[PDB]
Write an enzyme that holds these catalytic residues in place. Sequence first.
Site, PDB file in Angstrom:
ATOM      1  N   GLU A 130       0.758  -1.242   0.000  1.00 38.78           N
ATOM      2  CA  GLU A 130       0.000   0.000   0.000  1.00 38.78           C
ATOM      3  C   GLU A 130       0.797   1.304   0.000  1.00 38.78           C
ATOM      4  OE1 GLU A 130      -2.107  -1.032   3.734  1.00 38.78           O
ATOM      5  OE2 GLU A 130      -3.854  -1.422   2.467  1.00 38.78           O
TER       6      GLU A 130
HETATM    7  C1  LIG Z   1      -0.259  -6.466   3.625  1.00 37.53           C
HETATM    8  C2  LIG Z   1      -1.310  -5.854   4.581  1.00 37.53           C
HETATM    9  O1  LIG Z   1      -2.216  -6.564   5.035  1.00 37.53           O
HETATM   10  N1  LIG Z   1      -1.301  -4.486   4.700  1.00 37.53           N
HETATM   11  C3  LIG Z   1      -2.296  -3.702   5.487  1.00 37.53           C
HETATM   12  C4  LIG Z   1      -3.833  -4.177   5.137  1.00 37.53           C
HETATM   13  O2  LIG Z   1      -4.135  -4.058   3.931  1.00 37.53           O
HETATM   14  O3  LIG Z   1      -4.627  -4.624   6.039  1.00 37.53           O
HETATM   15  C5  LIG Z   1      -4.206  -4.824   7.435  1.00 37.53           C
HETATM   16  C6  LIG Z   1      -5.493  -4.856   8.311  1.00 37.53           C
HETATM   17  O4  LIG Z   1      -6.265  -6.001   7.918  1.00 37.53           O
HETATM   18  C7  LIG Z   1      -3.237  -3.786   7.958  1.00 37.53           C
HETATM   19  O5  LIG Z   1      -2.901  -4.070   9.293  1.00 37.53           O
HETATM   20  C8  LIG Z   1      -1.935  -3.842   7.090  1.00 37.53           C
HETATM   21  O6  LIG Z   1      -1.053  -2.784   7.433  1.00 37.53           O
END
Ligand SMILES: CC(=O)N[C@H]1C(=O)O[C@H](CO)[C@@H](O)[C@@H]1O
Lengths: 483, 483
Positions: free
Chosen positions: A285
């Site tokens: 992200e």
């Molecule tokens: C690879 C990943 O999961 N990245 C984010 C997400 O997209 O969701 C999570 C919550 O579900 C976050 O805590 C993470 O920072």
Amino acid sequence: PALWPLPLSVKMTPNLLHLAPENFYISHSPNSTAGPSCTLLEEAFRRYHGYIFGTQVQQLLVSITLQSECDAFPNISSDESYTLLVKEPVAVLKANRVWGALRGLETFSQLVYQDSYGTFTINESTIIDSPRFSHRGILIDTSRHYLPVKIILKTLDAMAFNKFNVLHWHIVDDQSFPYQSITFPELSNKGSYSLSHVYTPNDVRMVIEYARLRGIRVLPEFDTPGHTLSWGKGQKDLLTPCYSKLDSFGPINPTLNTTYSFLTTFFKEISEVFPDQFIHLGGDEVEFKCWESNPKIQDFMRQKGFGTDFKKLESFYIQKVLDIIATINKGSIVWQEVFDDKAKLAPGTIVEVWKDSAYPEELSRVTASGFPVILSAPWYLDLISYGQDWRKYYKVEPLDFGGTQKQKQLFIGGEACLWGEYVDATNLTPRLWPRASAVGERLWSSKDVRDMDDAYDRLTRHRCRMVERGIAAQPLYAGYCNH
Amino acid sequence: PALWPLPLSVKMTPNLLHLAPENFYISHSPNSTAGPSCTLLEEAFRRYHGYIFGTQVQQLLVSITLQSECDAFPNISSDESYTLLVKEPVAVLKANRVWGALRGLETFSQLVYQDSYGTFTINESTIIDSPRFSHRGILIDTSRHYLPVKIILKTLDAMAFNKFNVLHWHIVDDQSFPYQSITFPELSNKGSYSLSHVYTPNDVRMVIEYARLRGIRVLPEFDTPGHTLSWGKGQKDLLTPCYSKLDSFGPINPTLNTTYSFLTTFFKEISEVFPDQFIHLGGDEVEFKCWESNPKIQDFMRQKGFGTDFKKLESFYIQKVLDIIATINKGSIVWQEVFDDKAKLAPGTIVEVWKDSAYPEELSRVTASGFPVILSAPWYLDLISYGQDWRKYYKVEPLDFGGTQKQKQLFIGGEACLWGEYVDATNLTPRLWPRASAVGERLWSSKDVRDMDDAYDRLTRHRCRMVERGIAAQPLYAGYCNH
Ligand SMILES: CC(=O)N[C@H]1C(=O)O[C@H](CO)[C@@H](O)[C@@H]1O
Ligand SMILES: *[C@@H]1O[C@H](CO)[C@@H](O[C@@H]2O[C@H](CO)[C@@H](O)[C@H](O)[C@H]2NC(C)=O)[C@H](O)[C@H]1NC(C)=O
Ligand SMILES: *[C@@H]1O[C@H](CO)[C@@H](O[C@@H]2O[C@H](CO)[C@@H](O)[C@H](O)[C@H]2NC(C)=O)[C@H](O)[C@H]1NC(C)=O
Ligand SMILES: CC(=O)N[C@H]1C(=O)O[C@H](CO)[C@@H](O)[C@@H]1O
Ligand SMILES: *[C@@H]1O[C@H](CO)[C@@H](O)[C@H](O)[C@H]1NC(C)=O
Ligand SMILES: *[C@@H]1O[C@H](CO)[C@@H](O)[C@H](O)[C@H]1NC(C)=O
């Protein structure tokens, strides 16, 4: 009498053997590459004797066949297979390495039970077992909420009971930087929630060795370029300032040499602190907005001829980081975006597929390109819902995606993720167990083990066993435990 | 100085006063209907002294204006209003009854904080407060999972911190009968999960007195005629045998004289054990198929001229039970089905609205027919979901339904329910708090208290205070607490 995960090959007989607490020994076979000097095994022997007791089979002889690796740190290539021969007067546990012996000791303890009169009993039986996949992990988030070291250790204990072998430690993120860096003391000094919410070098060594004794790899994740707000507090000019200035900061600035020299010094340190062969670089992200709003970055984009394609800037950045890791005797793992945004990845780079939308296809694409892949997408245990959601995690069949056998071979395992926005010490354990046990069986047991009634039956009792061992695992459904 | 629920009227000044732990007394004002012989207040003074301390206001004088009711059990009619005057040298808490004093003590403890140097501080202030609604409950389910008395006591403490005043104890149901009955020993001997999973007469007295000392009513629910499977193990010919032949059973058999004589004796015992003025008769989800499949019941229906309308057979049953309750000096509460299925209810019978499909209209109907009503429908805390679901419970405005002012006056309050299919001692508390705190503020504070940012800000700190007091209330979002 409840096995979890269900071993590869189990042959039970109705013959009953009995153990005498004060006269039952777990010992080293005279024929073994390991002996009393093997601390890992010696500690496991004592540990499991306590888990077991709080004709007669008077002893369990443990035999390691090949070089034991007793003093080594586990690795993705570690052999965890083992054979258990339960008979009187001496039971025998044989394994190629100490890793397989660890698993066999857990299996053996799950075989012992107390009959109606409290008599310690075990059925005559033969077990042949080995994991379906080699990477079986739990992801914990100690940034959204700091987790006391003790609960991390309790989590590793539960992982060992479930045969998970990797703790993906997502140690830092936007909200806090608990990792205490020796080469950059201001990261935690300024980025931590407080100096009582930090992981000292000793806390870290502690997690790592405690994990090693249970055959668990500690995979550190130091997420960049995004998810790095907390890194800016103590490292000046690292983060990208945003513009309408703004007092807002974006991802790490990929156009500054000071960024790369800092990352170089930082990861050299990480390579010395975590012995695991891999370092998870994250890469998820990344918000492109602030980059685009920044004047200097606009110029950098012009000088590099990247036009307005910021994925190229991202790729430029990740590739330099990937190169740094490569020079410090470590392998890299990244979140899928690094791959999706067309970064040039060296062979052996592991890609972790986490996006839920059409992930089977992402699996094909990743393996098609020849990269090892780890699946976490269908196992975001932080996304709780009402009822028996363990069934949906259990039902997943990872290899169900288009591909050749050679492609399928690039799939090395998966991870149940417990992100921390809503998780801390007050609710971590019951939220994590036994829901993660479903992922544990799917990742360890053969693909054919899928019967829901049997799964429910063994999970219910395994959960009670976790509770009697001090793990506050939540219930699967109405009922009670005899503990 | 994080108040929760937000009091009706809060006038705060920037003047700071300080407390001396070793030199601070909570005492009975010389003008009060209560004194040292009042155990309820004496215990509260001690209890809150410990909570508070783990320009000097030397003392907090407590004055009870009307007959104290120090030795009584709280009632739906109890006056919980109070006034707090925080000034130096003596602060004053005044209330009509001890019930209001209890609430005032909690609020006073929430006004005290330690400044940057650990100095005990409180702002000069004036608080006038009273609850918006009279029935503010938490429903626990000790059938789907047995809950040790200690977690029930623990839940009562958290309720007090949150100003809840009713514990709806759904003590028995289909899966187990934990209640130990003196007149009917076999109900629990045969219906409990095990003898170590029962509530002895002493366990029950303990819950009741512990609750009373905190101004909390214990509302017992012995659900019939449905949800009664476990009752059948010890009381023969009580449940309806289903046919088609069948080792199967349905709800309580409403056509037998033995049923009513048994219920008459059973409820007489309940009226003696639970001092609360009300008994919840349950009456939800009655399945008619078993009744319809029974020949003898089919006969009865004929003799009664009920045709094929089993709602009439249900109304028949509940009307007889309602009559039994009326003869033992207790009032009745019933789940909405009883009302919906057209049973004849005497004036004053309370109806609990739990179905969330258009529950506002159900509220309109109930109150239109003149019956007091309690709402639980939008607050089923057992139905978990991802994120800040506390906000949806908080946004509910109970009186948003069609009706006159007189109709609206019949709405007496609500309950946050935590059914136990997936809840036991391992996960109850973190799942219940602070989520139930949202419902707690909506039922106590005025209708206009709705700012989300302010709510989030106070709840977050209130949750940390709960953790500090020993309640493992889960986090609202990322962050930490100043342990
Ligand atoms: C690879 C990943 O999961 N990245 C984010 C997400 O997209 O969701 C999570 C919550 O579900 C976050 O805590 C993470 O920072
Ligand atoms: C372990 O051995 C016992 C036998 O001692 C097995 O229990 C028997 O189970 C069979 C079929 O389930 C019954 O017919 C017997 O009555 C049981 N034994 C007894 C007490 O008579 C048990 O099943 C074995 N464990 C497993 C799963 O193989
Ligand atoms: C309690 O008193 C304190 C101190 O008078 C109040 O805090 C002050 O608030 C003003 C304006 O908000 C600030 O400029 C001061 O710096 C604060 N004082 C301190 C701590 O230095 C506080 O607002 C009062 N509490 C309430 C809720 O009214
Ligand atoms: C009035 C009521 O809620 N009755 C049932 C229901 O429909 O939902 C709950 C689960 O949410 C169950 O535990 C209750 O037995
Ligand atoms: C060890 O190996 C030898 C030779 O193969 C064998 O005779 C002996 O029985 C073995 N001892 C044990 C305890 O397995
Ligand atoms: C009690 O009431 C009397 C008479 O109104 C008054 O003089 C006195 O100050 C009061 N005492 C306290 C402590 O409030």
